[PDB]
Design a protein around this ligand. Sequence first.
Ligand SMILES: [Zn+2]
Length: 182
Amino acid sequence: SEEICLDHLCKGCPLNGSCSKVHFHLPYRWQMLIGKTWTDFEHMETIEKGYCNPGIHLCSVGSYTINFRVMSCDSFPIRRLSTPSSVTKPANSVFTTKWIWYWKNESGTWIQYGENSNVDSSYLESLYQSCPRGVVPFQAGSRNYELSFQGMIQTNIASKTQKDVIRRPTFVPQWYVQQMKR
Ligand SMILES: [Zn+2]
């Protein structure tokens, strides 16, 4: 499995070294595929900070430049292992990943859904987890839209104007993870 174990981050995984999930000390794990082995980046917190910002799709870390849109780093492919999405576990699970959904506005910036849309990040993330190929109808002001997950775009159904939609996690630094473990 490609999922980071929540029990290992919290009170402890009873499956010890036989767990089917990844055991890492952070809720995220950035890796680069070299040959046939995924290899940990050194400065994961910096990569994560760049990734979580919706207006940042480039991250120069070390010698290599990372492109989040393509999820590659100097040609070589990369990946971000994560803990389960927060909407799939109770609220007590503090180490789950909280995903924010943004749409890019006319002025060029990213706006969180709900900040006015009748859907929010919890709504969209839940729908996406239960169906990743769905289309979500929603309303904002007097306008109506369809949000396509598989295309990750919102479309006004009247004008057919399209706008980009992005899904990114909230950032947590390692020291705050330590605090959470206390
Ligand atoms: Zn485990």
